[PDB]
């Protein structure tokens, strides 16, 4: 890299991170999509 | 998954049961059976642990990916308990110990810690709370183990009124300290007993029955703010019971009496070690205490659990102690 440096991009990490498995900053999977079905919210005041 | 959590699926490993449980003391004898049943139906189980993560490994296979979650906690740190119950809808306390340690005595494991969990659970918004007590719990006995249980049971019933107290007898199973306790008296001589096992009546209960009872208390609505007494189907004399254990284990049975004070001293000798004591003064008292008969408390039959007779599932426990057995004489109901 001192002879052929990498191309610079503004989204590339400036700080390389080693394997974080087993540490408090590990990766935890989850769904990245929002809720599909919207349920009905009953009225907050009585009818009678 | 908006109001509580909606069950989904067939009730198998990859289903969703809607139960989000925090099981304190899940790394012990009764804990591994409670986690197995919760995780076997598709529940989100949170397992606080004080031990090495290596000692929690037998719990990882018990649930689908992401269903068993492990946290560090300290019995004397209220914040850690808060992090482990804030997201749960049911909290199960199985914290206990058969002996006192330099850092934890019976007033910590059975009174202060259970009350700490109950308080944090109440203000965290948890709706259901299951606490394990002892059948012979009352402040009148020579066992400091049983005196602590009575105090803790009252404090749990006060901090969390809607709690569900379970009062089981001596639980037997593969990893129990009851049938395996009456099988390790062979390297010293016969079988010491207060009196000769007479005037001591025991009503042991199967581990799966206790486990299945705790599960049904989570699902059952009419179990909030109630006390249960999980007991076996049959009653035995400690002499007859221990005789049966040795017969099933094919060990020579040579019972001889020993004075009550004499048994205390050998209990002192075996509690000087730094490891799990083989026996102690309190252990001898509890084994020789007579299992109370509380017919005013609903038991296993009130949760849809048929108590398992000790004769049916005693061979699976004592098989490993061996190097057509007559059932033990039982006390009639009368």
């Amino acid at each position: 890299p001192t002879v052929k440096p990498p191309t610079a991009r503004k989204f590339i990490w400036t700080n390389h991170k080693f394997n974080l498995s087993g540490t408090p900053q590990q990766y935890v999977p989850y769904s990245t999509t929002r809720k599909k079905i919207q349920e009905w919210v009953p009225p907050s005041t009585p009818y009678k | 998954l908006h109001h509580a959590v909606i069950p989904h699926g067939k009730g198998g490993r990859s289903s969703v049961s809607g139960i989000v449980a925090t099981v304190f003391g899940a790394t012990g004898f009764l804990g591994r059976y409670v986690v197995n049943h919760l995780g076997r139906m598709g529940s989100q189980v949170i397992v606080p642990h004080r031990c090495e993560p290596y000692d929690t490994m037998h719990l990882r296979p018990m649930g689908d990916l992401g269903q068993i979650i492990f946290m560090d906690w300290n019995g004397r740190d209220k914040d850690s308990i808060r992090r482990a119950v804030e997201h749960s809808s049911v909290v199960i306390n199985l914290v206990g110990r058969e002996w006192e340690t330099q850092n934890f005595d019976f007033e910590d494991v059975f009174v202060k810690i259970p009350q700490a969990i109950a308080q944090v659970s109440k203000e965290a918004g948890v709706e259901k709370f299951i606490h394990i007590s002892h059948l012979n719990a009352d402040i009148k006995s020579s066992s400091k183990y049983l005196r602590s249980k009575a105090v803790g049971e009252k404090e749990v019933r006060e901090t969390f009124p809607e709690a569900t107290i379970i009062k089981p007898a001596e639980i037997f199973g593969r990893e129990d300290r009851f049938l395996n306790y009456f099988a390790n008296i062979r390297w010293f001589g016969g079988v010491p007993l207060i009196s000769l096992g007479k005037k001591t009546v025991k009503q042991p209960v199967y581990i799966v029955d206790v486990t299945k009872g705790i599960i049904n208390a989570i699902k059952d609505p009419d179990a909030r703010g109630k006390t249960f007494a999980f007991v076996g189907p049959s009653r035995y004399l400690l002499f007859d019971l221990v005789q049966y254990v040795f017969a099933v284990a094919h060990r020579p049975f040579l019972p001889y009496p020993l004075p009550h004070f004499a048994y205390r001293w050998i209990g002192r000798l075996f509690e000087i070690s730094p490891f799990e004591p083989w026996t102690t003064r309190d252990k001898v008292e509890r084994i020789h205490t007579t299992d109370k008969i509380l017919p005013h408390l609903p038991g296993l039959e009130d949760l849809g659990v048929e108590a398992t007779p000790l004769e049916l599932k005693a061979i699976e426990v004592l098989r490993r102690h061996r190097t057509d057995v007559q059932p033990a004489k039982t006390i009639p109901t009368s």
Partner: protein, 156 residues
């Protein structure tokens, strides 16, 4: 000094010994066993870390599940695990042992060896290169180095 300090050095000594003599029992079930053999080959020479090529199950400290675990083989693998003297660790090698991999949806494949035995390190790949497996063994050694068996005992 404090009791924690004294019992923390003994923890280091036993942790050092156990990770410097990791003897593996390799369940070579499928192609991932070839890459396991390449980690013993001269280029990587796993024996230079103290990791003997192949120990008997009763002398073994770590089990490497390297390949597809089928239903027919599942009870056999559990029996070998139950007979391993402690402390015992399991390394899941490859996609088949990780989560079933290419045969995840088969009628005769266990969907991950972590339904039968507990797993300490998962090594991804199909197969992981011999260097990737070695990186996973050196991660298990780092995991043994972080154990606190005596601290937990002391603070009990």
């Amino acid at each position: 000094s404090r009791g924690e300090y004294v019992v923390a050095k003994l923890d280091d000594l036993i942790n050092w010994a156990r990770r410097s003599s990791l003897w593996p029992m390799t369940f070579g079930l499928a192609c991932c066993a070839v890459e396991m053999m390449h980690m013993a080959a001269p280029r990587y020479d796993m024996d230079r870390f103290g990791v003997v090529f192949r120990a008997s199950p009763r002398q073994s400290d770590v089990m490497i599940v390297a390949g597809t675990l089928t239903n027919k083989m599942a009870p056999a693998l559990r029996k070998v695990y139950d007979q391993m003297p402690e402390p015992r660790y399991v390394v899941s090698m490859g996609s088949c042992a990780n989560g079933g991999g290419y045969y995840h949806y088969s009628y005769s494949v266990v969907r991950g060896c972590d339904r039968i035995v507990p797993v300490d390190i998962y090594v991804p790949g199909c197969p992981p290169t011999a260097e990737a497996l070695l990186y996973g063994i050196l991660q298990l050694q780092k995991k043994i180095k972080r154990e606190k068996r005596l601290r937990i005992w002391y603070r009990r």
